[PDB]
Amino acid sequence: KARKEKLAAGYKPLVDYLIDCDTPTFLERIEAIQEWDRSRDDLYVWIPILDRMDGLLLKVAEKYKYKEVKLVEMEAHDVDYCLKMLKFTRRLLLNTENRFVYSSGDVLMYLLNCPNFTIKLAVMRILAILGERFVIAFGDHNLRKKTLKLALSLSSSVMHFSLVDLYFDKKKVPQKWRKLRFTHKVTMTTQELCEHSLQQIFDKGMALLPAESWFDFSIKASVAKAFSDDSGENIDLRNIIIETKLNAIAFVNTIFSPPQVSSKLFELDPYAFNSLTDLISLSETKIPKELRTDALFTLECISLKHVWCSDIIRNLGGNISHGLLFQILRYIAKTLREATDEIDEEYNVRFFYLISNLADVKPLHESLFAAGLIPTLLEIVSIRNCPYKRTLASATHLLETFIDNSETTTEFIENDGFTMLITSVANEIDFTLAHPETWQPPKYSVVYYSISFRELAYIRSLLKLVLKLLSTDSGDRIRNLIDSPILVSLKKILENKLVFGLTLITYTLDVVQKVINSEPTIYPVLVEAGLIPYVIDNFPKLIGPSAELLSLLPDVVSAICLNPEGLKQVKEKGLINNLFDFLLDADHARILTGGDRSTEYGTDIDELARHYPDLKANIVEALCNVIRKMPSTFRNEREFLFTSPKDQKYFFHRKNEEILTDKEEHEPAYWELLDKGTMLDTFTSVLFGMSLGNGSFSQVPQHLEARDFLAIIFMENPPYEYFTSVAISNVTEVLQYLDEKYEDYAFMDVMKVLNDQLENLNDFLNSPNDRSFFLERDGENSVRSCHSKLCRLAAILNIVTNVYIDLTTLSCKRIMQIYSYFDKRGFSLIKNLKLLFQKCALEEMYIRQHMPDSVITETMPLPIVDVSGDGPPLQIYIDDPKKGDQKGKITSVKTRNTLQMRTILYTLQSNTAILFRCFLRLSHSRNMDLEHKDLTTEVHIFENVVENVIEMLKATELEGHLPYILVLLNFNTFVFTIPKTEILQTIPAYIFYQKGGYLLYLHIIRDLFTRMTKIKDLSSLDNINYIDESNGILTLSCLINALTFYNKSMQTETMENVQSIGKYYVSIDDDYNIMKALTVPIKVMALAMILDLDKSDSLFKTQSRNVPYSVFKQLLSMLKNIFTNVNIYTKELYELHWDLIFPPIKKISLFEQVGIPGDVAANYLTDTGDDLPADNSIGLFSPEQWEKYKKLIGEDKSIYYPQPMQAQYYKGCSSKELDELRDTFFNDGLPSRIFTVLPFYPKLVNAFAKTLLQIFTKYDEPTEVFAGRILDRILETDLDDPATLSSLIHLFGIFLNEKYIYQKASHLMQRFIEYLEKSLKPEHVNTPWFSKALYVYEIILAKSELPHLEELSKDVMAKVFRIPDPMKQKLFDILIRVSDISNFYSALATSRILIFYSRDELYANNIARSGILSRLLKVIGSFQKLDKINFLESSFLLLTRRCFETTENVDALIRAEINRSFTAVRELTTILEEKAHVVMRSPSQFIDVLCETARYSLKRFERTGIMHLLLSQLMAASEKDWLSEPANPSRNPVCAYMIFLLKLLVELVSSYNQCKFEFLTFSRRNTYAERPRPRTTAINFFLYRLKHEAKRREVIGMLARSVIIGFLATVQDLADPHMNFIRKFAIEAIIKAIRNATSSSKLLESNHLKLDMWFRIITSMVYVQAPYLRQLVEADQYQLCKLVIDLGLPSVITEAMASIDLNYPFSKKIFNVAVEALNTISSTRNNFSEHIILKSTVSRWKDIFDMFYDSKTYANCIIPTVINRLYKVSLALQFAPLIDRAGIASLMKSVFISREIYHELFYRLCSSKQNRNDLMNTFLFILSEGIIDQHSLEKVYNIISSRAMGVRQLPSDCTPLTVANQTIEILQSLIDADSRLKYFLIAKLRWPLWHLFSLLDRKLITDESVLMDLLTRILQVCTKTLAVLSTSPSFDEDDLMKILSIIMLDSCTTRVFQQTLNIIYNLSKLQGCMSIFTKHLVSLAISIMSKLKSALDGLSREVGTITTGMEINSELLQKFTLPSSDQAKLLKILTTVDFLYTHK
Length: 2040
Hints:
It is an enzyme of class 2 (transferase). This protein has 2040 residues and is mainly alpha-helical. It is built from 101 helices and 10 strands. The strands form 5 sheets. The chain has a two-stranded parallel ribbon with strand order 1-2. The protein is globular, with a radius of gyration of 47 Å.
């Protein structure tokens, strides 16, 4: 954006010129701008004009209300007024760049409704150029319809007559156009139109037809009015209409897709291309110039879509040297050489762009190259003294684009291209320098040249071409050919930068560098030429503001340095200094992007240093200079905070203040605009690039102290956005690199800088805390100064945290450096950071208290580039953050100031918090041993930080500052935790406790609880999806944070395990673990607080939910933690002081004051056991020393030893007090208060259990007793109270889940079962408790179903409760009778229980008969909008399957699984563990199978009705709408229901035979016929009846295909008769469907969708499978193929294709799928010797097992019985035609339709003799008598269609060329692939081969290069084989002449020539051919020689005549330069004879 603003500033004078003028002057001004003398101006700078124009245009529209619309003509005045603007807009768009900024299109769309056709033409012309960018890299349907209607206006040609004929007297206008006949009816005769005026005609038509037709009438009437006139203005209107048609054709191609264009416009107007190409010819002057240009532009636009490009070539004669295209090119050359006004440079450039677009296509590129494009372009370019430099520049660019491959380069060079280019460049430069008068640089722009920019463009194109050629083949180009005068011209260019601009200098230096790098031996020559000496001696002059030039500079320096003398010159002259000095200039710096380009420049400099180490010393030095110099360039550029105009105040001061609502950009962007901003953004990128290489830049620490480096990073007074700038990112990377290389380079300096900056802010930090600093100082100058300081500090903190002090980057040396800094500098930094965070939070809060709420959401700082949000400061929103309130509305000066303030404060707080966390972590991050000198400092830092945090907390009262207290609590939680869940930092927390921090937290918690009790409503708090400034929500959040911290600091699982206190002290009693010891006092305090709350009757004993759920959850977690046991008995905790850590520093300091050495004192202290010397008996102290010590020791000796902590809240805090409080609570608290409290908090029932289980678990009271208490409560409760009963039952279930209670709860389970039987009834299915009841039952049932355990007799698990059988039956009966279910959870529980109950076959049968599945399915459908629905779905899916698994099926499955397990010696335990689910499915059968197979190692020795229900529900749902999306694929509930049903059906039908049988015999009428006969209802339903809607249809179609395929597949367990029968049934159904659908073409058009689906299905069924179903067989494939072929399907497909029309749109797509199906059948014939998640059944068994037995060890329970069976006994004992000759004809239609699948299919069919013969015969028939003429082609197509079926119009796009191409391509591919075919051709028309020879006599083939090439390849292969046969049919002179004629053909390219030579040689191998060949070659040469002699005589005479200045006749040169010249043919003849007589 900054670059665009700078460019606009540069262009400013133009905008002033074009905007300062009024409308009458503005129009006459824009009219004057016709020719552009400067490069394409970016449209951005033209935006100011556009808008103006836009508005003005709108006015005219509003004058006539074109914005229905009447048919009123714009007055001539307004017509001209709008034209003068539209034409200028066209010109601007033509001569501009980056047009996407154009946005006034809607004005054009509205104007498009104007009836007058001139405005239509202008608007269409404009729109055409619009959208070109879209196609290179509008959506209104009305616009598309209108443009399409415009395009079809008139007919390109009518019966022939074409509009091009209008401008000739050889024909008369068609009489159809001379009369008006419009229909929608309106009719006007020839005479009627003349009299009636155009507006009168519009009025007449308007009264007759509705509004929607008027537009079209306006066209037709106009056309009728235009054509219905002998002469006059009608002719001009006729031309305007034609031009409008052309422009509409151009535009429609841009918007419509290629197929859409073809099927919408060209089919309606087939003769469009010919008419277009008939107009662009320059040779005829009769055509209007505007019309010709419009036609050329239309062709250019069409060429963008390459699909049509080829056609254009064929129309333009681009493939023949004498075609229209080359005629136009030669006429262009002629007109240029004559200097006549006929020249139209616009036309020429358009033509060259069109040619380049055509050449973009490879086959078209080859066609153009062979036709002789390069010689013609050379003819154009080689002109001398041509003043039309634009045409030459465009031609040269075209030539450069064309020459890409080796052959083109060789062709260009052979024709003397390079010498001509060099001479042209030299002459151009010399002439430009020698004629200053011709100079005319552009105005109204910033340029660096004085030439007219025509010469500039010409020379630039020439130099680009020269560079291309040099790069192609450097060897000779850059050495032998560049020794022309070009070098002196390049020297002139370098010497005249001011004249030749920076682009030419760039290209000259690029050429010099390229030539030097390749063949460096040329270096002296340049030195002799004076080029390199000039570059070396004037390097600074060359440097200029151009990105490419600057990027190139290091390459130039390297090239110069390639020579040792050059290197010495570079070192002496100091060019390296120039490589860097420019970076100090903003202009150069801005041009170099601060991104990829700058980094590339840096890496280039680094590579230069690497190549030549001698330069390193200089390069580094250069850096060290610029870095030192840069700070001098910094200056106070501008200001970033502006006072508001109304009150002169920066920030708001009241919540109700109105907003000025300015218009500027919402969020200011300053850094990029600042000069120093971009300068640093570029320089730091360069530094980062250099550092990447790890080369020279590593030495900058030498010669440059870190202070100077930092001087440029932390520059004074940066913008608020500096810390997010790219400069800071690059500096971060560079400093990380340097820190890694030099850890002790900058860290100390940056820390000192940060400390100094914080010191400077002393006034701000120490301001009063009761009022905002800024708002108090608002309106003063000090505000700006303070904000500048804060911005600098924010940058410093960002650098420090991101680079040096980061948890990830905490290296050992880093930690030691931190210790050293804090040791030698003091801890003022910690206090300053505390004050900084305090003040930032206070300012945030206070500011938010005075801004209007609208602004607060506008100035939220959170969305910073790389903050991520997580971590402090906590953000308090006013609206929901996740909503669409993305800000950006209602800006203002005050709003921007506040946004800057808030962003700076946020970043400061965040970085301060990160720093504090790192300081509290320090050494514990690395776990590195620390000496006493270091460990002492670490604890000192911890003490200071913790005391500062505590002071921060104590400072502010809790009332009225909740938004600040919340931030403080969040910051405390963040600081005291380690990232991971987060784990508390144990030692900082211990120090926090010892200073009373937890006491403050307890006080805050109690105060917040009292405040919460005063909140009127608590339900609203439960809707806390985000934090809000509401008092209630803030209080809740603060309380939650405090309680979360307290919990965090009570669980040993979430506290860092620092070692015991023995590390620190030695004068201690017990070395208690710090982590465990700390927990006890916290528990005591928390328990005391809870006891107090209960005493207040606030927490428990309440009759209502007077506490939010989250708070109660936290309290329950605290209760759970308090009653956990940690093995420790603390009697006293010692304060952790840094003085007293052994050895005591306090004593050591005293000894040092006495005089004893520190080391000596430490040794004495260690030896003396930490005891002071009571006497001098040790003798350590001298008499005077002892005298001083005894005085300085002090009277109190306790200060020198650790002292116990004081009791904080309770009487004490030792473990004894904790036990006392636990006992007190246990006998009066929750264990008795649970029931009176539980019902009020149902959602927390689980949380309750975990707590209670803990309590008793500590006191060992019988849990079963409490479970019995719960059961008694349940029994007491009446069913009228579901709310309490459900919670009670859920709690009972949770208790019973634990294995302890379950083991001891047999009687409880029995009683509960009895109660459930006596009370549960189907009427309660909807009540909530019901579900929970079943859940409890499930818990019993899952364990009552475990395999029974037997006893053991001879050889080398706990108990379970078995439900009484009658109770089981009673419960099943109650469940089955369940009526309609309305509760989702009830249905889920019922399904889960039935899963267990269905294991037995009889129970499954009862479930199926009962119909409960129907009710469950109804529930599933009803609740499809519930998120949890999936859980039910899966459950149901598992249940239904178990209803089909009969005993035999499960037996077979377990047999297969066991066999797979064995075949995959093993042990019984591992087998059971792996196959636990299989065991659980049927333990008895598994035991039987295992006993049968193995011998704990083991030696490797009948209508269910479910399918009826599923299908009926599926189709009924299909009736409803399952395509429309909901307001605002699974989103549609019906779609989700249908996909679930289809997945279930796929699984069921694929897995079980019974499912297949039921699917086969489905009956929608529920016919009760025993053994129901097979019905097609289901198959028919699936086949026929079944952007977002597109995806839904695709998904459902895929599912239906999978369903049908699975039905066809074989059930996982030689053809089974039943499977064979069902496969036959389905195949016959599909065959019948296809036969019925394909009858007649109309039915096919109607049901193409169904036909495509059926063909996809039939392809999938045979190939392998369908989509999905992969997780659920070769035998199936083979059997399906056999049945398909036997049933006669391939015939059916062929007859389906034979009935297609080939003209309809979709009919061409059905053919492809039919061919795909046939190819798939042929491929799956590969058995020649013979000729959304889905899971398998076992996977579903595993899922069922996991649903209830997630232990995997219950299988071991069955181990005993196996031993009782096996080891008890074992130990005591041990082709034909696929198609029928009629589908082949149907298949041949593929050659008449505009590929690999066809090749494969034909190759496969060739394997059968009959099919091979028929196919080859049909191919040869088509070639022989199909490719002659359109009539013959249609006749052969009709014959083929008749044969296929047993007159039809050929497709319009089908022509003999396309048919011939496709046929020959297929034939050649077949011949190459199969060697048997060519023998068919070999085996005169009798021989098939002689048909192909006939093709050589047809202009259709001989004139086409590709057809000739393919035909020659085929003939080469055939003739080689024939010659081999002859040496290991007969030919006559006519055939040899025919073959030899190929040489004479102009289409005989290199490949064709080589193949023809091979053919001729092979024929010569045959007898009697060499003589004929020679006799004909001599005659051909003799014939050519006369022409050559005449041409040579003419050329000799002409060359002799020339006398300078003139040029050889173009016509005479044509006889030689053209590739069809006689000389080339003579060379070919001679080469051919030589090859014949030498190939031996």
